Design a protein that fits this description.
Shape of chain A: rod-shaped
Radius of gyration of chain A: 12 Å
Entry title: 2C9, C5b9-CD59 structure
Largest sheet of chain A: none
Largest interface: C-E, 26 and 24 residues
Distance between the termini of chain A: 12 Å
Structural class of chain A: little secondary structure
Number of strands of chain B: 1
Chains: A little secondary structure, B alpha+beta, D mainly beta
Radius of gyration of chain B: 32 Å
PDB class: membrane protein
Chains A, C: Complement component C6
Distance between the termini of chain B: 88 Å
Order of helices and strands of chain B: EH
Helix content of chain B: 10-25%
Largest sheet of chain B: none
Organism of A, C: Homo sapiens
Number of strands of chain A: 0
Oligomer: part of a larger assembly
Keywords: Complement, CD59, MAC, membrane protein
Helix content of chain A: under 10%
Strand content of chain B: 5-15%
Chain lengths: 29, 49, 47, 43, 48
């Protein structure tokens, strides 16, 4: 597919200020 | 005897297109010979390294 | 491709009257899509 | 547009009439704009 | 880097036809109609 037809969202704010948080971004499918 | 015909056609085309192409670069050097600085800091767009 | 077409004929005699009608319609749609995406990254770290 | 109307009758006497009408109209319009802009600052 | 290309073609075709003939006097009337709607889209993005 042209997957970017269903654009990716902006990332989460990082889960924590320090010591390896994570952030994610789903598509607007 | 009598006859009538009417004929009509309408056709429309519209087209458009755009480009934006932006390139930026800022090589920075401290130390070494001023000629080497200027020669190397000068951005060879084909070889930015 | 879609087509719907009809033909009708009538004659009546008593006086004579006749009516004949033909009606036809064609509908077609075609859509073509293509897309390409490629991505890559390099890291190099040397000491 | 095309229209025809005529009469032809016998009676002795005979009378005939024919009228012919043709009309065409055509219109075309074309408009084009092209803009090309370059900015190059080096220092 | 990412390099992204999308191509899209859309076509629609429609026709209508009608003809009628009466006899009594005698008369005829007829009409034809044809249609198309068409769209092309191409969109691209490149980052480095």
């Amino acid at each position: 597919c042209f997957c970017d037809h269903y654009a990716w969202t902006q990332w989460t704010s990082c889960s924590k200020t320090c010591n390896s948080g994570t952030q994610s971004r789903h598509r607007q499918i | 005897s009598s006859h009538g015909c009417k004929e009509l056609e309408n056709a429309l085309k519209a087209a458009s297109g755009t480009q934006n192409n932006v390139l930026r670069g800022e090589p920075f050097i401290r130390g070494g010979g001023a000629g080497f600085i200027s020669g190397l800091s000068y951005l060879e767009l084909d070889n930015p390294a | 491709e879609a087509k719907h077409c009809v033909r009708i004929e009538t004659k009546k005699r008593v006086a004579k009257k006749t009516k004949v009608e033909h009606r036809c319609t064609t509908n077609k749609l075609s859509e073509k899509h293509e897309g390409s995406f490629i991505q890559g990254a390099e890291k190099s770290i040397s000491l | 547009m095309a229209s025809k109307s005529g009469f032809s009758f016998g009676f002795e006497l005979g009378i005939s009439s024919q009228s012919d009408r043709g009309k065409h109209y055509i219109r075309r319009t074309k408009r084009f704009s092209h803009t090309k802009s370059v900015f190059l600052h080096a220092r | 880097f990412y390099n992204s290309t999308w191509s899209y073609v859309k076509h629609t075709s429609t026709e209508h036809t009608s003809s009628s003939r009466k006899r009594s006097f005698r008369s005829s009337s007829s009409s034809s109609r044809s249609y198309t709607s068409h769209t092309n889209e191409i969109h691209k993005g490149k980052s480095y």
